[PDB]
Design an enzyme around this catalytic site. Structure first.
Site, PDB file in Angstrom:
ATOM      1  N   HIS A 159       0.788  -1.231   0.000  1.00 32.18           N
ATOM      2  CA  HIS A 159       0.000   0.000   0.000  1.00 32.18           C
ATOM      3  C   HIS A 159       0.823   1.286   0.000  1.00 32.18           C
ATOM      4  O   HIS A 159       0.364   2.310  -0.492  1.00 32.18           O
ATOM      5  CB  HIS A 159      -1.004   0.035   1.150  1.00 32.18           C
ATOM      6  CG  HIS A 159      -1.860   1.260   1.146  1.00 32.18           C
ATOM      7  ND1 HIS A 159      -2.666   1.598   0.078  1.00 32.18           N
ATOM      8  CD2 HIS A 159      -2.025   2.239   2.066  1.00 32.18           C
ATOM      9  CE1 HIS A 159      -3.295   2.728   0.345  1.00 32.18           C
ATOM     10  NE2 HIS A 159      -2.923   3.138   1.545  1.00 32.18           N
ATOM     11  N   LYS A 207     -11.437  13.304  -5.651  1.00 33.14           N
ATOM     12  CA  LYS A 207     -12.565  13.674  -4.808  1.00 33.14           C
ATOM     13  C   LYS A 207     -12.069  14.387  -3.560  1.00 33.14           C
ATOM     14  O   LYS A 207     -11.162  13.906  -2.884  1.00 33.14           O
ATOM     15  CB  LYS A 207     -13.401  12.456  -4.399  1.00 33.14           C
ATOM     16  CG  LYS A 207     -14.449  12.799  -3.327  1.00 33.14           C
ATOM     17  CD  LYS A 207     -15.085  11.560  -2.704  1.00 33.14           C
ATOM     18  CE  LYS A 207     -15.958  11.942  -1.506  1.00 33.14           C
ATOM     19  NZ  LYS A 207     -16.592  10.769  -0.831  1.00 33.14           N
ATOM     20  N   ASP A 209      -8.007  -0.168  -8.129  1.00 27.54           N
ATOM     21  CA  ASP A 209      -7.404   0.337  -6.896  1.00 27.54           C
ATOM     22  C   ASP A 209      -6.566  -0.778  -6.289  1.00 27.54           C
ATOM     23  O   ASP A 209      -6.656  -1.934  -6.714  1.00 27.54           O
ATOM     24  CB  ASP A 209      -8.489   0.763  -5.899  1.00 27.54           C
ATOM     25  CG  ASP A 209      -8.027   1.857  -4.966  1.00 27.54           C
ATOM     26  OD1 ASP A 209      -6.801   2.111  -4.886  1.00 27.54           O
ATOM     27  OD2 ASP A 209      -8.895   2.468  -4.309  1.00 27.54           O
ATOM     28  N   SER A 219     -11.521  -2.114   1.136  1.00 28.00           N
ATOM     29  CA  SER A 219     -11.856  -2.408   2.523  1.00 28.00           C
ATOM     30  C   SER A 219     -13.342  -2.145   2.741  1.00 28.00           C
ATOM     31  O   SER A 219     -14.160  -3.042   2.555  1.00 28.00           O
ATOM     32  CB  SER A 219     -10.995  -1.575   3.477  1.00 28.00           C
ATOM     33  OG  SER A 219     -11.229  -1.934   4.834  1.00 28.00           O
ATOM     34  N   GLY A 277     -15.042  -0.258   0.912  1.00 28.22           N
ATOM     35  CA  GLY A 277     -15.603  -0.016  -0.407  1.00 28.22           C
ATOM     36  C   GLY A 277     -16.074   1.416  -0.621  1.00 28.22           C
ATOM     37  O   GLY A 277     -16.595   1.750  -1.685  1.00 28.22           O
TER      38      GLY A 277
END
Ligand SMILES: Nc1ncnc2c1ncn2[C@@H]1O[C@H](COP(=O)(O)OP(=O)(O)O)[C@@H](O)[C@H]1O
Ligand SMILES: Nc1ncnc2c1ncn2[C@@H]1O[C@H](COP(=O)(O)OP(=O)(O)O)[C@@H](O)[C@H]1O
Ligand SMILES: [Mg+2]
Ligand SMILES: [Mg+2]
Lengths: 284, 286, 284, 286
Positions: free
Chosen positions: A124, A184, A210, A214, A216
């Site tokens: 990540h 966003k 992505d 998790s 979502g």
């Protein structure tokens, strides 16, 4: 070589072993009455390069990894190599704010202390790789995702935010497709979306990619925006499908399909990364 | 000094902190949606001797300890000192079959790498102390158990097996009482028990002491045996009251009372080891 | 040469003696009223190479072997050679945990003290051979098993676990067949099976081979797995058929047939190892 | 010192251990599904003088002894000392026909190879002692039998055959009594018995002593003979009460009471040899 297949990674590990024509060595494993973890590897691992395959996300997975790293010391192995398809605690990783642990640091130090190498698929954040004393490799599910979508009608590949860009660019380049991302931001209780570049998605088929799903929330918000603007089909992919309640339903509110990898095994694991991991094992 | 009180040890750590006139510093703690553990210590721990108090037996407890050991590196501390009132995995202190972990070894190595000292109360086997790079002290609940039972009518102190003898010898001597142990063994589906020495327990009040009660099998069986031979009262104590699978009720089928310490907090935790841990803390300073 | 045929080995010993054109010398044997064992060999064994044939598994078999090793000292023999078709206490053999005997060590030391050589057929673990001061040979039932199955329709030879591999590989090579093994592990109350390689057994005829059948648990679990996956025929073989209650019925729940050797004589002893033992005797 | 109490000798070994203020260490013991024997001794026997106490006559007893002798090699012991209160196969101490085993020879050689000493109580024939590489001591139940019968009204001590004479001489002397033996022999399907000397047993109370009672034939016959000639009381004792095939009842057809020792435990085991074995143990030290 010996492949050790831990509980969290049975499916991918099995796929890997089959490809390598070797046994997916599983522990005998149970809990003592008091809840403590018991493991046993009765196979003779002496003189072999060992590949332990298991995720490092849940408390139990961490204990399974740590206890395995002890159990195999019963054998004079050639090397010990950790492969955590999904690497836990890479949720940054640094301190914000203060008095917070850099969890991936201490955990990576521990793993690195008991292995000759570590690898994971699409960590990540890559800062975590620097916490290892041994080589810590970041493998990529890109090619497996490209393989899956080569036979799908796609107009654009899309990142749900302004961070998963390199992956989206590489995947789209490999599919021969254009791409864009959605930024966003929340500004005073109201939400603002920008498409970059400002692609017209009216009647277009979109693949959103992505690294992790998790809750979502991020993907579901972006799917809703695009459906709203007239997207005709939305495919949602991620490497690591955690799907905490009730992410699947939030996403499928506006997306047509979900396809994730077997790094984390679920009903949506339609894309295997075994080839990518086999490449690493072969080249190690 | 700063005392950090982890979730599993709040009762004992609070008693310790109050005795030492200091804050029992608790983390802000929660689980992320994906189930990973979040901790935060906002207190400035810079320049202090830190004492982290928490057990190390459940998966969650181990994560709490490890993540705390990372969190405190955010501060320039004088020292970092782990106190795990109950030390997990001390039952797996060697390999009993090929390919087993020596779980207490790897875990001790981890804790030792991130601290200046470790201490526990009545570790199940002291071999594990030797797995630690830093000084690993084995504190004892003995004096606390004595303090409780000096006000109870007791004839003998008893070990339920031929292993916890030194503790029973020490406790009985400090109570001014005699003692014995029970040897239980299976010989072809039949159980044989020997009392050593072969004390007549008829009309006698017995204090049974062990380090850990988990499934409670050995103690429940011994209690039934002693009750059968005419014991008038049977008190059961242990340092660590884990109580799995109805253990306390199986024991109480034949024993009169259970009293354990607060290393593991339960409704049976009537004997606090706070003074023993405080003495250790005072020694290491701060 | 003189062949001594002990109670446990009358059938195989008889087969051996007939092949060698010699007498299967049996003891006069009875129990005294107090339960002590009495043996007598009234034949003059002076000047002969002696081959004592008997198993070393039950308390009585051990006493029969030990007392025989004393009885024959009444004669100035040329050599004394122990052949235990099934060797007891080779159930590892080491200490797990502590304060356990290494039973095969002390027993092998005793036997070796009173003989010039020892041999057995397919010992359960070869470490035990190292406990003997005299040469301790491990004979193999492989060829006899191959001879039996040459006229049977077999698709794969299978090991029930990841330990009897060399035997399965050799037998299958000799039959000209493919082979695989089953790895079974228990992980938290649930059972997990892997086939290695992951052979499709749907509609296939399988020969499962193991060294010993005791409770039949291991073989019965594996037969059930394979039948479940569509195996059309399952033959079960082992060298040593102990069959403790009620192994036979557990196995035949899903297997079609059981064929074991005469190392341990039972109704399922369809395969004799006399040729293999005669080879050893001839070459000693 | 460590006393190991095997299954066959639990009663005697426990009495011995209690006298010597030590644990009667029992193995955990069971049979595998296939019938092989499993033992485990978890007590740390390192650096101690070990005394293994168990009989050696049944197949299971021999396996128990041999496997115990292997198990104790898992510890660095000071010494290993076998005490077989009843020593099996001592009746087969030579070859009586070609091709027979000298069973007591091979078994003694085995035990001697894995111990520093062996001892038994009243071996059936002392020739077997010479089969042992290590010192093989023959203890005697004499004083224990005397201690029991010093409180019984006895006129003569009697051997039921012309073989157990030294024991009967010693026991009678320590009771302050006279003695004789019976010689029984078959001469052409007819039995002839001689008393030596030819004591008049009318109205006399007799103590018959032998080393072993197995089928009880010789003693039952002699008891009937003596009862026939007017004996008023007949007591039967032996060191080892095996009692096969109704032996005790055949004897009690004509004898009044049977009292044997605890070398082989039965309901007739009224005379313990624990002190004799304890003296031997003290001598070898620990
Ligand atoms: N948390 C636990 N609960 C129950 N048993 C355990 C636990 N951890 C380890 N064990 C087991 O306990 C056994 C060791 O205990 P024990 O038989 O008393 O030997 P030791 O004398 O070495 O402690 C081992 O089989 C080990 O696997
Ligand atoms: N356990 C036993 N029970 C009965 N008889 C036995 C036993 N062991 C050996 N014998 C037999 O007892 C006989 C020897 O006894 P015995 O006639 O008194 O001569 P000895 O004076 O040499 O003892 C032998 O025939 C021997 O085979
Ligand atoms: Mg233990
Ligand atoms: Mg005799």
């Amino acid at each position: 070589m010996k492949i050790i297949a831990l509980r969290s990674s049975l499916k991918l590990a099995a796929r890997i072993a089959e490809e390598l024509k070797t046994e997916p060595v599983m522990p005998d494993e149970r809990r003592f009455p008091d809840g403590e973890l018991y493991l046993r590897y009765d196979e003779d691992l002496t003189g072999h390069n060992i590949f332990i395959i298991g995720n490092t996300h849940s408390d139990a997975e961490v204990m399974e990894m740590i206890l395995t790293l002890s159990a195999i010391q019963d054998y004079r192995t050639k090397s010990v190599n950790i492969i955590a398809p999904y690497y836990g605690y890479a949720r940054q990783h640094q301190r914000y704010k203060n008095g917070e642990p850099i969890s991936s640091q201490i955990l990576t130090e521990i793993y690195s202390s008991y292995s000759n190498s570590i690898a994971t698929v699409d960590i990540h954040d890559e800062k975590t790789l620097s916490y290892s004393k041994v080589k810590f490799s970041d493998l990529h599910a890109n090619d497996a995702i490209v393989r899956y979508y080569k036979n799908v009608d796609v107009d654009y590949v899309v990142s749900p935010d302004d961070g998963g860009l390199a992956r989206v660019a590489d995947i789209s380049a490999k599919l021969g497709k254009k791409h864009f991302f959605i930024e966003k931001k929340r500004i005073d209780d109201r939400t603002v979306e920008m498409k970059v570049p400002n692609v017209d998605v009216n009647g277009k088929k979109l693949l959103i990619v992505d690294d992790i799903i998790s809750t979502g929330g991020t993907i579901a918000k972006s799917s809703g925006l695009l459906r709203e603007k007239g997207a005709s089909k939305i495919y949602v992919s991620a490497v690591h499908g955690l799907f905490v309640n009730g992410s699947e339903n939030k996403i499928l509110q506006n997306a047509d399909e979900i396809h994730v990898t077997d790094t984390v095994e679920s009903k949506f694991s339609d894309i295997s990364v075994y080839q990518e991991v086999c490449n690493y094992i072969r080249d190690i």
